[PDB]
Design a protein around this ligand. Structure first.
Ligand code: AZA
Ligand code: AZA
Ligand code: AZA
Ligand code: AZA
Lengths: 304, 304, 302, 302
């Protein structure tokens, strides 16, 4: 292994070209992105056999300073004329390999820094502000791209993946976990109605990488729409386990987006412990935080 | 000083009585709370001279175990028939002093664990789910209460405060910071148009503590409404500093809510560093995260 | 309330004047600080009635920029000729009030950023004078409040030193029994628990000048306080955290008669026991509890 | 991809069999572990084609509950008769595959929860056998993957030990010069910087059984790796982080010929210099940089 790079390259751009012309799905009102504020946290990794002596000999002649990579990324956000994080990464990657001919491979991660709208009164009505936004620490979109330089100096994308990270959903009823193995290691009671709390990280891969860029936006798959599929399927489903749930979410995603090749889930179980089961004259209960150990699932659904 | 207690007492209640009948303000659509899910993180502190020997002699005869306080809090959330965190704290406090006659003082903090609604398709339309909610790590409501037992065994509230914590707002334009002291310690340039980014913690105190409880809900001041005042005033104001902004927010709060005695602000400055000032054929710019040192302000506005 | 300031002012200085000549105590090997690397995280807050219109009118005429406060602190760390965080806070506070006549009050917090020695071979193995390890464990703290009086004199109104983030577990020799059992009590009595405490310990001096280090025989080092706490924890068959922190405070006040008080903020993080008995062993297995934690706050006075 | 499991399985055992008889090296005083307190945080992941219908149909018939995996790990820590996290992972993995015939693959991570000795007076000052300090600094790690073959035999396919979270700063004797200067370069060359690195160091054995501790002469302790890194950092006039980690890896492989490779994940956290020159002193003042950090990933092979 031989790579080096720069992480936590925060970059905030105002007035990026808006994303419009997307194709809708029943589960989601998503219709585009205004891009008054477009925030991204980028990580860049680069490799190439010509870098060996920077490790073995202390020779920095072919070292692009990691600080310079930060400058590169931030200056390219200013010149980017596209509309997606996925497209931004392609722009940075192609540009970097063109600039630095001794680099053979580049890997990029971009994570959305999401902002929400806020209310303001002006001119007699209350409406969403075009100026004031709220920083969100909830779920966020992600993108990943790897690009290589070939022997003939052409550049190729070798892997692309988009995602939604940090979605935390609790369904208060309509979930069971029963029928699992009861042996000398089992102390978990069967539960026919639990308040399932899942953390979800959902990643998708396109059949055609061009569709990830937003250039023909009707082919773009938006993290917002993926979120809304997840919440809809969770609601609709009498869940039998998290495994059961995430397969159903993945199937719905692939049905709604035939341009996707596969969808990958990282889920965690954070369901609360029950403290009070019955409340007089109420359907309510009281729960509390569990001990730290958490269940998790890793699972891919493919169009095949 | 002599106190002991329990922190991080998480408690989640389903189907609390809903909060309705509130009085509206222009800056906010807030009209109540459904309370399908009501989450609170409670901290309890207790004191009393009768506790001295638990420290000086190792005598636990009068020690309520901190673990038992956790049970007390969680069981009282199940029996609580009110509609606010402020009212819950009063219920816990009164109940605890009634149970434990050698305790002279109790202090409670309750912090909302907020959940947001999600979309689901069912029966032919998409609508907000009554079952699936999204855990939010953004701003949250707070409450504080201190209660004492007097010589005649009556109980009195000695301080009450409500709040909104963790509000993070960025206004992209329409802010200046100019005209400050320029001396041998000054390297900050004057800026006539900066993207001010503030973190805000806003706390209010009522003229009449009864108004905090929700029993006559038209007198309750909701953290949601306070949030919306903050965003509205930020939008409306050509800010001259954070100090300037927070005074204006506080004045608007006291004007909208004449039942409040005062409002207290803890603000922090997290404004980004500018990297690209001019983008061809655009009003956009690029910014990045600053170094760690952050400005802060602490400021009270009173009805007087 | 009306103040403003700057937080997370990190400042790292190399080769501060060494802290030497400290009175050593039985519990601790501490005898000074080399100060090859001196790291502090400073928070400054200032007030004055003349600041009112910066809030009420947007008038920045009398605003020292918080960014400039950052520069002030970092440049004063470069010119500081003393040997403690406590003395550094006094230097900053006096300098700031002397510079800015419209400021009536200043409050400072300084938190050590601690670095530990590491081994190098140079031959034989010894502590390096160049390579240090950044520690995210316990750290020293200092607090100072200073005011300008009506007669233009300056006065320290509050001073407090401390040790923060000490996390100690004693595997045996601790009990928690005899507490109230009623409808809300589910906790079992335990005659031998592995008490795990977090400790924040703060102390005040009878004479504020003893905090500065200028006469090092009267300086109380956070390193010595740590080693008193572990020594007392070891020696004591504890009956509660309450019981332990009282005895730690008594020992501190006995070792350091120049101190007026010691204040504790403790938390309980004791593990849940999962396996009570292991064939042919003294040992047991435990695991992390649910999040709710007990805490205690207590002052011992000289 | 199809697996599931349990993370943050904390398990604390008292009086594990001590690790003794380790080969000591010049760079490190390490000679074993008392194991009065042994803490590990375990993550388990399992797979098998027979798990498919638990996803596709909601059939829990063949689901070992993740909660039960937690119980499995904690109870096996109570019955473990060995002396390392690496050997504990092997015990859990073999036991789990022997118990659950429908599981084809298991992957384990174990992370040390480290505890440091403290002083007590008992008389004279000495290390306590009862009171320990929880450390949030560097910690040992272990990784193991085991599979069931077509012929029902079990095989370790992957094993890796490590040291995580080592944060080291060298105040002088580091340079970063000679790198590419073009339209995107603003970083100044620096012939004497206080290089601050975070290090995660991982190693693989030629023979997986040397990882278990069963013959302690062949065991490579994370404590020894730490002290090699600080020793090499001290000795080296570094020319980059790249240059440093290569030399640390070379030294590790020379000291431990039983190792097949060492892998590094490094990050740069060097401070920004604020004051270049201090009257009549060697010293300087620095402060924390903006968030973006450099990193390096590199493998050295025996
Ligand atoms: O949904 C669940 N899947 C699981 O595998 C599991 N194990 N314990 N609880 C669980 N819940
Ligand atoms: O709004 C601000 N207030 C301040 O006091 C300040 N100081 N630096 N920047 C600042 N911005
Ligand atoms: O030392 C303790 N003090 C307490 O007050 C307490 N309550 N539960 N456990 C406890 N342990
Ligand atoms: O050691 C370093 N290696 C690098 O690649 C680098 N880039 N900026 N600073 C650096 N320091």
């Amino acid at each position: 292994v031989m790579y080096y790079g720069k992480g936590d390259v925060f970059a905030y751009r105002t007035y990026l070209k808006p994303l419009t012309g997307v194709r809708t799905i029943p589960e989601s009102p998503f219709s585009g992105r205004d891009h008054i504020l477009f925030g991204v946290n980028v990580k860049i990794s680069v490799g190439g056999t010509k870098l060996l002596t920077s490790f073995t000999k202390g020779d920095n002649s072919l070292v692009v300073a990691t600080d310079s990579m930060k400058n590169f990324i931030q200056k390219h956000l200013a010149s980017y004329t596209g509309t997606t994080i996925e497209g931004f990464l392609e722009y940075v990657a192609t540009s970097f390999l063109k600039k630095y001919s001794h680099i053979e491979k580049i890997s990029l991660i971009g994570e959305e820094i999401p902002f929400e709208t806020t209310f303001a009164v002006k001119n007699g009505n209350r409406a969403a502000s075009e100026l004031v936004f709220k920083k969100s620490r909830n779920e966020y979109a992600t993108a990943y791209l790897n690009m290589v330089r070939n022997e003939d100096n052409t550049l190729n994308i070798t892997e692309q993946q988009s995602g939604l990270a940090g979605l935390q959903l609790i369904k208060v009823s309509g979930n069971s976990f029963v029928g699992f193995i009861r042996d000398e290691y089992t102390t978990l009671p069967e539960d026919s109605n639990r308040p399932l709390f899942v953390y979800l990280n959902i990643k998708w891969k396109y059949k055609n990488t061009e569709d990830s860029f937003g250039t023909n936006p009707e082919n773009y798959v938006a993290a917002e729409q993926i979120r809304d599929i997840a919440t809809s399927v969770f609601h609709e489903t009498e869940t039998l386990s998290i495994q059961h749930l995430i397969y159903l979410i993945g199937r719905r995603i692939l049905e709604r987006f035939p341009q996707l090749q596969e969808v990958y889930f990282e889920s965690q179980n954070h369901t609360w412990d029950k403290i009070v089961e019955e409340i007089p004259e109420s359907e309510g209960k009281v729960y509390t935080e569990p001990r730290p150990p958490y269940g998790f699932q890793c699972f891919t659904v493919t169009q095949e």
